[PDB]
Design a binder for this molecule. Structure first.
Ligand SMILES: *[C@@H]1O[C@H](CO)[C@@H](O[C@@H]2O[C@H](CO)[C@@H](O[C@H]3O[C@H](CO[C@H]4O[C@H](CO)[C@@H](O)[C@H](O)[C@@H]4O)[C@@H](O)[C@H](O[C@H]4O[C@H](CO)[C@@H](O)[C@H](O)[C@@H]4O)[C@@H]3O)[C@H](O)[C@H]2NC(C)=O)[C@H](O)[C@H]1NC(C)=O
Ligand SMILES: [Ca+2]
Ligand SMILES: [Cl-]
Ligand SMILES: [Cl-]
Length: 435
């Protein structure tokens, strides 16, 4: 069984679209008119109020603020969402602050206000709608598919993917933001996002779990050239009995994926990803510092990563801030102690730079013997720059200090050594100096 929608072609319920374990019931997408896909174009010149453009009548494009000499990024929302006065339109607005771009929001809110397994079908029609438009740009205006960027969140990512497939993966870039897990994880490449969908496919995983048991809406499966798992991928900082998942698609963790990206538009290197097999390995500092070439910048500037498409499923782990701009930079801090007696307290250290200076961070807790070296990695929320000096602090009667403190910048690998012969009483900020 199949349905056809004029120029958008035919859609069948044959495997793997339906009638499979993950998609038991044989559904077919709604009509284009019932899904009501709308392309809302934002521009530097019209950042707040969209212009409505269609591929059916590409005189609408000419009339609009679309520019050929400019890059073009699509933003596709997911299940039970919209674009108007929401995060897609808010995201465009960020982009105008750093670049010149045709921002196109794909709004299919009516087709996304459906039972979920219906939305998973409707996306196909939305995906066609998009490609039909993307092809019109090439056909009517000679616009290159390399300049097209498609950013999709959740179902939006597989919608993105669908359009990418429809165009034989010629579209310049797809960015999948916590791509929807239910009805995609472990399924064939035809129906989900995968590296073949665009020249460059980069994915931010934030609410990831396997299908059994389900503990999130994201894919744990790696589906890009680059796959980022900030904070482990399962639970983001800031976010027995009957288990209710009746609103998972609006989980804080799940929505955090577009929050990071939006932030990365304005804070380019606030989210550096480190090459790593597991989050544990990263937590334990095996994936530090950045490779010589450099780290990929997770988010809007991922396209600058040297060798971004040399391999598929290149895993990256990083840590982010818990709130606000969400930015974070990684540091490995080594401190070796001095004193004349072993005290039972704990160590704090501060970073002092050219830009500003950090708060105090805990480094060790328990037995504090002299000569003892203690290493710890820390998450600083801002780029301190060149570390001019450091400060050591301890608290529980006698004197204690730090003789050497080593700080290694995750980003550029740079290693800073600091020294002092002093030892201090509890709570006194001893300051070390370059050596
Ligand atoms: C997005 O994310 C973050 C928002 O949460 C931003 O990170 C913040 O950056 C600032 C520096 O730009 C950090 O530093 C400020 O605070 C430190 C230390 O504060 C500590 O001691 C205080 C005791 O009074 C307490 O109030 C604090 O809780 C904490 O324990 C201060 O030393 C600085 O203020 C003073 O010092 C410098 C001199 O170097 C002067 O410039 C100031 O005028 C002032 O005299 C800093 O203002 C801040 O801590 C940090 N926030 C967190 C939670 O980490 C981030 O910058 C932001 N934006 C961007 C662009 O990324
Ligand atoms: Ca695909
Ligand atoms: Cl406007
Ligand atoms: Cl609203």
């Amino acid at each position: 069984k199949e349905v056809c929608y004029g120029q958008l072609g035919c859609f069948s319920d044959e495997k793997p679209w339906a009638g499979t374990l993950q998609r038991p019931v044989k559904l077919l997408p709604w009509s284009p008119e019932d899904i009501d896909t709308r392309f809302l174009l934002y521009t530097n010149e019209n950042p707040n109020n969209f212009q409505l453009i269609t591929g059916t009548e590409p005189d609408t494009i000419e009339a609009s603020n679309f520019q050929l000499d400019r890059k073009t990024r699509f933003i596709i929302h997911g299940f039970l969402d919209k674009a108007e006065d929401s995060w897609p339109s808010d995201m465009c607005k960020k982009m105008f602050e750093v670049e010149k771009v045709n921002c196109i929001c794909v709004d299919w809110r009516h087709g996304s206000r459906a039972m979920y397994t219906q939305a998973v079908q409707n996306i196909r029609v939305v995906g066609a709608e998009t490609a039909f438009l993307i092809q019109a740009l090439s056909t009517q205006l000679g616009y290159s598919l390399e300049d097209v960027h498609v950013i999709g969140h959740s179902l939006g990512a597989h919608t993105a993917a669908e359009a990418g497939r429809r165009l034989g993966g010629r579209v310049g870039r797809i960015t999948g933001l916590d791509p929807a897990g239910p009805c995609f994880q472990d399924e064939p490449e035809e129906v989900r996002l995968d590296p073949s969908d665009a020249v460059f496919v980069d994915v931010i995983h934030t609410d990831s779990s396997p299908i059994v048991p389900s503990l999130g809406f994201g894919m744990s499966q790696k589906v890009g050239h680059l796959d980022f798992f900030p904070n482990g991928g399962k639970e983001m900082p800031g976010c027995d009995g009957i288990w209710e998942g009746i609103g998972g698609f609006v989980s804080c963790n799940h929505l955090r994926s577009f929050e990071y990206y939006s932030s990365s538009v304005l804070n380019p290197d606030g989210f550096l990803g480190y090459p790593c097999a597991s989050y544990d390995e990263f937590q334990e500092s095996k994936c530090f510092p950045c490779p010589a070439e450099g780290c990929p910048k997770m988010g809007h500037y991922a396209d600058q990563f040297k060798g971004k498409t040399s391999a598929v499923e290149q895993t990256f782990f990083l840590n982010t801030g818990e709130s606000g701009n969400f930015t974070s930079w990684r540091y490995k801090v080594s401190v070796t102690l001095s004193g004349k007696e072993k005290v039972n307290g704990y160590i704090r250290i501060a970073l002092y730079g050219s830009n500003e200076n950090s708060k105090q961070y805990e480094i060790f807790k328990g037995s504090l013997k002299p000569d003892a070296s203690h290493t710890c990695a820390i998450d600083v929320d801002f780029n301190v720059g060149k570390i001019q000096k450091v400060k050591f602090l301890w608290n529980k009667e006698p004197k204690l200090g730090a003789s050497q403190i080593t700080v290694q910048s995750g980003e550029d690998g740079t290693e800073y050594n600091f020294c002092s012969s002093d030892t201090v009483e509890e709570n006194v900020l001893q300051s070390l100096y370059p050596c």
